[PDB]
Design a protein around this nucleic acid. Structure first.
Lengths: 511, 705, 249
RNA sequence: CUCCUGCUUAUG
RNA sequence: AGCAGUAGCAAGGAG
């Protein structure tokens, strides 16, 4: 029972891997069974204390919390896959039998008249004009003949990548040549950009109420007892009645319907180029209608792993003039004129080649799960409020309570806009959605470090005299993970202005 | 007008405005390509922290060995992290530890651990995550790797009749004494292998890239061990698991919220007229390259000093297997020409020969790892990678947090895997410099590097511990993963009830205020409906499954009794999350509908909630077209034999079928025993008993030959 | 006559050549590591593959002879329910599931289902006959306890339950006889007059015994009284900032 | 740079 | 071209 198999190579394995002042494991076992401590320990401790050179850094005396270094270089472009604020949509009442995306596309080919959709072969700006002109003409006659499958031409052979891949050669034959095919590898990193100025007006557009009503497909209400189910039902109904009308709900409906359509098209048809609408569905005067924002084209996805990065071509409908700073990656053409009753303004078609991926479909197609953190946060506010006042005061608390947001541009010092708590929940669904799009590595590292500085600001609010051990490497990491994400650079700038507004009262910061 | 979302924190706390700063709704970061540079960064970064040059030659392995204990060359840069441990210091902290609580502490906890080792069956090895199968050199689940290892044993020399932990470990060491080991390759040929190659192969650890971790800009290499390292690690994690359960300044098994209240109130009840308390939140960085296993050999030789003779030798093998581990170096890199058209692949084998095709960083990392490389692997002897001893380093944390220097100024706190909260009590601020520099001194001596960038402190409770920000009175909750709401995906009946189960367990454990739970219930309802294409009857949806429901709705009398999988509305609520949908609805169904749904004679289910929609999807098509078709033949044989042994023993899925004789012999003796019992109170017929006897005897002669 | 059937199957499986090196080479315990040969890695995206499964035309594997006994090849407008592609198992559409649910045969089985699931219908009957009141809106909170959460009336401790299901269903390979038997063997004499002749399979019986005798004890945050009747109502009775209790009986 | 090769009907 | 970020995807084969 009490015998382990004393082998031969393992006993030469244990005796070799002992510490250096020891010969064998027997010597270490007899020394460790006969160990008694001493007080030369504190001499080794203090002899380790003397050769240190480390001082703590206070904050009431050396308040060096400088604002962050936003890179002063070229402005960060608009890199979201679709258009948010510059969108234009064609409407019709919805047919119940004609509901599949190909049926919606053909019914809007007769509904939105593509016969007048005349494009010049010379664009306003961009890179490639002839491929997009021939591509738009070919897909326009392809939608005309009521089949979504592009015949092989050089336009689709150039845009959605066919034959553009490296020849992966294994190391079994290599056929060496003297000073010919000199092969090696080389890495770069990522390009660095500057501060976006367009993100503010898209935030303020994203929370402004659009007259089309309900945009998000929620579900029905369960029955309620005489419990707190009245409370949960009430909070769901008020918050639901606020978030259905905003423009963020329109863009979430666009992502759900469009990426659901492209997703099932990625399942059913590999290797074949499809034509997929970019649309929504919402209630206009009670009539359930659907819209149409653009035309997306798949690029023969063979999704082996969770990566794969297939090519999506987007033709977009816009009714505002372009900009070579924001709309930098586009290939803006001109489409025509639109009668807009308040007289007949212009119509511009945008062109952009981009990519999606198989893991970056499921986190987009299920983007209805952004109403979960919002109601959690608002309910933490209200339930902490009644939990501190110990009385059922919710219905008047949702009306007589302010929330400071949105300081102005020319001045910042103690000049804030107090809004109601449900307009705060408008801003919360905007910011959770903006997390739902722009999540990369850089937003992750920036969110950890802003949790640290948020702990410093909470320490500043209550006069606790916090301290830090090294401020050099801290800003080397926060200035390390700010390169090119628009949301990361924006929230860095807004973190600096938070430091200004908190600097107007508490004393740990700079100008 | 500008807009700023952070201004809510001007008149709130960080107990409410802290879920706003988690990016948990977006995509997690993935890795791409090979994972060689991360492993080379881990090994070379391990050797750069060793602070030494003292090499010892080896007689076993054909590579050199660099030592990691008591051999320090003290540079001036002491704030840069070290990987060198003084053993007399940490044993002095162990002797200082066990005199705090009890006298026979390690004898008691070690005897409880030895009480649980002897009553353990080795099927507990199959209740784990993925492992490394060295027969095919792949990553496999635990059952497949265990069965291929036992297959190599029973094919190599003799058979296996162990059925215990200790006899399987003794079988492994007997495999280390074997001069030649045979296994099977791929079309199932049988190959052999020598002695030292088996030693090089049992101590091989596979590295890959950690995919989907929220919170890093740079990627990290995670490592998974083989099979012959797992049960010894189960031994040590049971021992150190009992030690951590017995201690009172740790937080791994879990309450993690009451202990901090008792130490804040108790150490705030221990103040003089001028002393005070300052807490410091830390984050011990480079934790997986600064725990050497030789110190675990010293302390693991110290804990079991008076336990047994078996336990004293059985808890001193996994440190010795961690002192000479190899590391798989990923799968190489790729080269390309100037035109970026043809791109050859160089694996980890030929990386020595094609060394002149690398970058500046690849050559700088590769020239400092060169005298430690084998053909495919690397030699590491001091690393403690992820997926290993986790509840043993926390004991070092309790040992650093129970140091006694002899004023009356001291510290306490709480420890996790690499997260601590330290409370200091002193009188003046230069004395705070003295005591805090003593804590960084004792951690720096023992081998624990505190990071200076991710550390702070205040006077009262305003600290951080495993992402729960404790303010002056209140507690923020753990920010949960959203995709845990929908990961069932197997049935139209085991999805919505599973989602109610996950909403129940997140409501009880985490905070999850009620309207959030009703919202998440209703959203998971909508994703269920949109996934399985079933919509309510009053909706306007007309697809291939709502045409039947819209046509046949006249037959149902009571309309609010239909299933959600069949076009009914929602009837579960917050106060009904513990009852499934069917069992809530069966008091109102029409009897033709209820007797029609629940019929066990159905074409789908024939071949925890009620099985009435439970169907099986079809399999793939690329599973029978590669060279691994015969593996599906092998699992077909295993399912056939398991169906036969399930057909013999009528109650086998309830109790674990222990035993060490054979399977078919228990079949034959069982059929003869029930043939005798059902013979004498039953059968009685010569053709039936003689025919069953004839089939058993002829099957026995056919099996034995 | 079951022993002739099992003898024919056992004599059939020894006719295979390479299968004789499988059994009588492993162990009785090895059944557990013969049960699991799941060579797929994790099935790491089940809902993604299930949405890709339900998007096709024929995702389901279904039995043939029952569906050709009672089903129809196609519904009234082009809705396909059948294939002829390949054992004789036929792919089909979930429109056959809802069509079986609306125009299919019916067998009266309400007593069996209302006898297997006695625990969950007991939860429903205890759920319906309660009454609530106002909320309180106060701070609340208490530590983690080990709480039995089910109103059983026997209270076994997860060791006489596996042993009890050995000594009730199938005693031919049950267990060594302990001292935990005698009074529980009077209960065995009670139980064998129940599970003697039923259409319930032995795995379903082994399920249904284990949920009327086992008080499910878990490690949960509780507050107030710790009665096991109000512990499935744990999540409803109070949160962290609110509390509701007005139960008279 | 030149030349040879494919099925999967998708409905918030 | 493009996605993407410390390395990959953007069909496969022959010359």
């Amino acid at each position: 029972e009490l015998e382990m198999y004393k082998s031969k190579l393992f006993i030469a394995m244990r005796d070799e891997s002992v510490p250096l002042p020891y010969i064998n494991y027997e010597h270490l076992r007899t020394r460790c069974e006969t160990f008694k401590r001493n007080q030369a320990e504190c001499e080794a401790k203090v002899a380790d204390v003397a050769s240190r050179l480390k001082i703590k850094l206070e904050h009431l005396e050396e308040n060096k919390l400088r604002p962050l270094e936003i890179p002063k270089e070229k402005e960060a472009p608009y890199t979201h896959k679709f258009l948010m604020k510059d969108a234009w949509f064609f409407a019709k009442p919805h047919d119940s039998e004609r509901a599949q995306p190909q049926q919606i596309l053909y019914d809007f080919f007769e509904a939105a008249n593509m016969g007048f959709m005349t494009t010049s072969p010379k664009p306003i700006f961009g890179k490639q004009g002839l491929m997009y002109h021939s591509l738009w003409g070919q897909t326009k006659r392809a939608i005309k003949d009521k089949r979504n499958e592009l015949e092989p031409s050089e336009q689709r052979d150039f845009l959605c990548g066919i034959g553009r891949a490296s020849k992966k050669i294994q190391e079994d034959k290599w056929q060496e040549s003297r000073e010919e095919e000199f092969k090696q590898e080389e890495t770069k990193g990522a390009a660095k950009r500057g501060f976006p100025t367009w993100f503010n007006e898209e935030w303020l557009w994203a929370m402004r109420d659009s007259k089309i009503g309900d945009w998000i497909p929620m579900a029905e209400m369960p029955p309620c007892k005489n419990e707190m189910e009245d409370y949960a039902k009430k909070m769901c109904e008020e918050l639901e009645s606020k978030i259905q009308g905003t423009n963020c709900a329109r863009e979430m409906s666009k992502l759900i319907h469009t990426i659901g359509s492209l997703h099932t098209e990625c399942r059913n048809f590999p290797g074949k180029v499809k034509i997929v609408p970019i649309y929504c569905r919402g209630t206009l005067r009670g009539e359930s209608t659907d819209c149409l924002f653009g035309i997306a084209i798949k690029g023969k996805s063979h999704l082996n792993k969770d990566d794969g990065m297939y090519t999506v071509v987007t033709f977009e409908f816009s009714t505002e003039e372009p900009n070579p700073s924001k709309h930098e990656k586009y290939t803006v053409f001109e489409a025509g004129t639109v009668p807009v009753e308040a007289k007949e303004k212009k119509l511009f078609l945008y062109c952009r080649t981009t990519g999606m991926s198989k893991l970056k479909n499921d986190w987009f197609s299920k983007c209805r799960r952004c109403l979960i953190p919002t109601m959690e946060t608002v309910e933490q506010i209200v339930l902490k409020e009644c939990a501190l006042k110990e009385e059922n005061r919710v219905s008047e608390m949702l009306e007589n309570k302010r929330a400071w947001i949105a300081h102005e541009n020319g001045e910042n010092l103690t000049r804030l806009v107090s809004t109601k708590l449900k307009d705060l929940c408008r801003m919360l669904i905007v910011t959770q959605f903006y997390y739902c799009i722009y999540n990369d590595n850089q937003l992750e590292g920036f969110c950890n470090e802003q949790k640290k500085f948020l702990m410093f600001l909470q320490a500043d609010k209550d006069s606790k005299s916090a301290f830090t051990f090294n401020q050099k490497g801290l800003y080397e990491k926060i200035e390390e993970c700010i390169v090119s994400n628009p949301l990361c650079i924006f929230l860095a700038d807004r973190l600096n202005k938070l430091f200004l507004v908190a600097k107007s009262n508490g004393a740990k910061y700079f100008e | 007008m500008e807009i700023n979302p952070y201004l809510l924190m001007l008149n709130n706390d960080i107990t409410s405005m802290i879920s706003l700063t988690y990016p948990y709704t977006g995509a997690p970061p993935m890795s791409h390509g090979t994972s060689t540079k991360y492993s080379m960064e881990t090994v070379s970064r391990t050797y750069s922290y060793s602070r030494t040059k003292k090499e010892v030659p080896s007689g076993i392995f054909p590579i050199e060995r660099r030592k990691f204990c008591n051999t320090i060359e003290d540079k001036e840069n002491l704030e840069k992290p070290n990987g060198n441990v003084d053993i007399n210091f940490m044993l002095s902290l162990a002797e200082m530890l066990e005199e705090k609580m009890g006298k026979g502490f390690f004898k008691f906890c070690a005897n409880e651990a030895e009480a649980e080792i002897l009553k353990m069956h080795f099927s507990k090895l199959t209740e784990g995550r993925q492992t490394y199968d060295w027969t095919s050199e792949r990553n496999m689940p635990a059952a497949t790797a265990l069965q291929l290892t036992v297959d190599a044993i029973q094919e190599t020399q003799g058979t296996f009749k162990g059925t215990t932990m200790v006899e399987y470990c003794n079988k492994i060491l007997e495999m280390m004494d074997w001069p030649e080991v045979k296994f099977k390759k791929v079309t199932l040929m049988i190959t052999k292998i020598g002695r030292e190659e088996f030693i090089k192969r049992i101590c091989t650890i596979n590295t890959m890239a950690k995919d989907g971790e929220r919170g890093k800009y740079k990627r990290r290499a995670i490592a998974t061990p083989g099979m012959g390292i797992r049960p010894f690690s189960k031994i040590v994690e049971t021992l150190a698991q009992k030690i951590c359960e017995r201690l009172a300044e740790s937080g791994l098994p879990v309450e993690k919220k009451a202990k901090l209240k008792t130490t804040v109130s108790s150490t705030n009840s221990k103040l003089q007229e001028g002393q005070f308390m300052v807490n410091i939140t830390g984050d011990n960085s480079k934790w997986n390259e600064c725990q050497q296993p030789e110190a675990y050999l010293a302390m693991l030789a110290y804990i079991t000093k008076d336990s047994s003779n078996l336990m004293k030798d059985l808890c001193s093998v996994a440190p010795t297997l961690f002192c000479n581990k190899y590391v798989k170096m990923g799968q190489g890199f790729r080269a390309k020409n100037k035109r970026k058209t043809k791109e050859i692949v160089i694996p980890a084998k030929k990386m020595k020969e094609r060394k002149e095709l690398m970058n500046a960083e690849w050559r700088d990392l590769f020239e400092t790892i060169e005298p430690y490389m084998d053909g495919e692997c690397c030699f590491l002897g001091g690393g403690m990678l992820m997926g290993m001893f986790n509840m043993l380093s926390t004991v070092f944390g309790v040992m650093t947090l129970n140091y006694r220097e002899e004023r009356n100024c001291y510290w306490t706190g709480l420890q996790s895997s690499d997260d601590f909260v330290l409370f200091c009590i002193s009188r003046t601020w230069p004395e705070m410099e003295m005591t805090i520099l003593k804590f960084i001194a004792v951690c720096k001596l023992m081998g624990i590097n505190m990071s200076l960038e991710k550390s702070y402190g205040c006077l009262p409770e305003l600290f951080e511990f495993t992402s729960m920000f404790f303010s002056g009175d209140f507690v923020s909750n753990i920010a949960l993963e959203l995709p845990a709401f929908t990961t069932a995906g197997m049935n139209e009946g085991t999805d919505f009830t599973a989602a109610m189960s996950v909403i129940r367990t997140n409501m009880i454990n985490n905070g999850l205020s009620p309207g959030t739970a009703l919202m998440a219930l209703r959203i998971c309802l909508q994703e269920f409906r949109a996934t399985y294409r079933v919509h309510p009857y009053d909706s306007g949806v007309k697809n291939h499954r709502m045409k039947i429901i819209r046509k046949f709705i006249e037959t149902i009398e009571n309309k609010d009794g239909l299933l959600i999988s069949d076009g009914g509305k929602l009837m579960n609520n917050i106060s009904s999350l513990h009852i499934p949908e069917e069992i809530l609805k069966e008091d109102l169904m029409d009897p033709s509908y209820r007797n029609r749904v629940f019929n066990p004679r159905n074409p789908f289910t024939q071949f925890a909630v009620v099985s009435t929609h439970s169907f099986r999807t079809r399999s793939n098509r690329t599973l029978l077209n590669t060279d691994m078709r015969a593996m599906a033949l092998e699992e077909k044989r295993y399912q056939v034999v398991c169906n036969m042994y399930r057909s013999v023993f009528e109650s086998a899925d309830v109790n674990t079928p222990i035993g060490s004789m054979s399977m078919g012999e228990a079949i034959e003796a069982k059929i003869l025993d029930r043939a005798r019992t059902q013979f004498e109170n039953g059968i009685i017929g010569g053709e039936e008993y003689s025919e069953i006897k004839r089939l058993i005897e002829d099957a026995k002669r056919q099996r034995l030959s | 006559s079951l022993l002739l059937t099992l003898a024919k199957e056992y004599a059939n499986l020894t006719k295979d050549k390479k299968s004789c090196k499988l059994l009588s080479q492993g162990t009785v315990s090895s059944y557990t590591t013969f049960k699991k040969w799941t060579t797929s890695r994790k099935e790491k995206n089940p809902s993604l593959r299930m949405r890709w499964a339900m998007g096709s035309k024929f995702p389901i594997m279904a039995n043939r002879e029952i569906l050709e006994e009672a089903g129809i090849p196609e519904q009234w407008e082009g809705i396909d329910l059948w294939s002829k592609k390949d054992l004789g198992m036929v792919l089909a559409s979930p429109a056959a599931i809802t069509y079986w649910n609306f125009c299919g045969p019916g067998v009266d089985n309400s007593s069996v289902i209302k006898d297997v699931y006695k625990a969950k219908f007991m939860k429903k009957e205890r759920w319906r006959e309660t009454l609530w009141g106002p909320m309180n809106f106060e701070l609340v909170g208490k530590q983690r306890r080990v709480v039995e959460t089910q109103p059983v009336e026997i209270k076994l401790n997860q060791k006489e339950i596996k042993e009890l299901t050995m000594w009730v269903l199938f005693e031919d390979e049950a267990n060594l006889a302990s001292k935990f038997i005698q009074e529980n063997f009077s209960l065995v004499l009670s139980l064998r007059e129940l599970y003697k002749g039923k259409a319930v399979n032995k795995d379903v019986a082994a399920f249904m015994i284990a949920h009327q005798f086992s008080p499910e004890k878990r490690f949960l945050p509780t507050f107030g009284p710790i009665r096991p009747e109000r512990m499935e109502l744990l999540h409803c009775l109070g949160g962290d900032f609110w509390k509701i209790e007005a139960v008279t009986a």
